[PDB]
């Protein structure tokens, strides 16, 4: 309350830190019409906490890491829900990592029990494990940009993160969508 807080620091100390992640995550999940939040998909705080702790890390450092970082991680945690095949895997990973009485001896596999045999020696796709690394690549660009932020980041990431660069304003206004 500022009994002896100098007035100058007595105003910066009521900042309302904004320390935690779940209140930020729900403001993003409120944009999808299917989900309803509890205490068409029905999700509670335990599921959100476990999914986020698997995908993002510790959940009360939103101020140390920034708000663009939190907004990006919230986008990823939103897309990691909305279909159960990954949701259940993330929950089982969380449960094996903690290690209570109900650790399921390992998380589930990422590959269907079908595609494991589709690439076993008695399968159509075995020989595909023998090609170059030129057949495994997930990106192709014929126009190379002058920035490395544009080479090793996605487009959404660039838009969220480019305001932190050490470049002039005319330079920063040349990255991301040309909408400007």
């Amino acid at each position: 309350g500022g009994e002896g807080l100098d007035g100058a620091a007595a105003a910066a100390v009521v900042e309302e830190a904004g320390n935690e992640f779940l209140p930020l995550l729900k403001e993003v999940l409120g944009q999808v019409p299917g989900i309803i939040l509890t205490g068409e998909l029905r999700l509670d705080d335990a599921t959100l906490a476990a999914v986020s702790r698997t995908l993002m890390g510790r959940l009360d450092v939103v101020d140390l890491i920034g708000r663009n970082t939190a907004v990006e991680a919230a986008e990823r945690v939103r897309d990691a829900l909305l279909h159960p095949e990954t949701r259940e895997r993330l929950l089982a990973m969380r449960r094996w990592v903690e290690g209570g009485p109900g650790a399921p001896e390992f998380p589930p596999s990422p590959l269907s029990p079908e595609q494991t045999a589709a690439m076993s020696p008695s399968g159509p796709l075995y020989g595909n494990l023998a090609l170059n690394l030129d057949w495994w690549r997930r990106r192709q660009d014929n126009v190379i940009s002058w920035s490395a932020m544009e080479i090793l980041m996605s487009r959404r990431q660039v838009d969220l993160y480019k305001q932190d660069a050490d470049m002039t304003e005319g330079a920063i206004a040349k990255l991301g969508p040309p909408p400007a």
């Binding site: 159509p124 020989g127 595909n128 090609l131 170059n132 030129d134 057949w135 997930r138």
Partner: protein
């Protein structure tokens, strides 16, 4: 198993030297069309200087052809294994299941056994071409203006000499802390470590 691997290795090794001597003989004895001669393919420093300073562009192109005959020979004689691997079997190019066995084969590099050049030839070639460019001011003579002139970029403005010359010990005392900072923050003690 080892039989096929040594077949690949030996085929590569023989095609290299065959193509190299074939280009040697051709350029020395048949481009000119008395006694059959065979060159010795070694480029000294004095020879690089002579070629850089006094010879045209075509002489340089001939020397480079001599350097790369063997790699081109290996290239002309190799079996692209993509067809054999995806015929005996059947996002990423290995995800396409449509197309035709013939045009499904250009989606990425051929699987040649011996690809990638040999570092000695690359050193020789770039040394020759760099001598030519930097010791011969063709088409751009206003680029002699910054030669033997240093513009004092990363350093302290006015620094006086050191014990070999001046018996003063302040710049060395500051260099020591510079090295401390480098080890603690930027590099570490070895390659690979995050910090000290």
């Amino acid at each position: 198993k080892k039989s096929f691997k040594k077949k690949y290795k030996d085929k590569a090794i023989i095609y290299y030297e065959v193509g190299k001597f074939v280009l040697n003989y051709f350029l020395n004895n048949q481009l000119t069309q008395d006694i059959t001669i065979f060159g010795n393919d070694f480029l000294n420093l004095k020879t690089i200087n002579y070629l850089s300073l006094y010879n045209s562009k075509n002489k340089i192109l001939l020397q480079l052809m001599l350097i790369f005959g063997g790699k081109i020979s290996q290239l002309l004689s190799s079996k692209n294994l993509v067809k054999s691997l995806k015929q005996a079997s059947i996002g990423m190019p290995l995800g396409q299941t449509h197309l035709l066995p013939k045009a499904l084969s250009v989606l990425a590099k051929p699987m040649i056994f011996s690809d990638g050049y040999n570092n000695q030839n690359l050193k020789t070639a770039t040394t020759l071409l760099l001598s030519f460019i930097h010791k011969r001011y063709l088409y751009r003579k206003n680029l002699i203006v910054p030669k033997l002139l240093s513009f004092a970029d990363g350093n302290i403005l006015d620094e006086p000499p050191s014990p070999p010359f001046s018996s003063l010990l302040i710049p060395a005392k500051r260099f020591e802390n510079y090295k401390r900072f480098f080890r603690d923050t930027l590099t570490g003690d070895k390659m690979g470590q995050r910090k000290s």
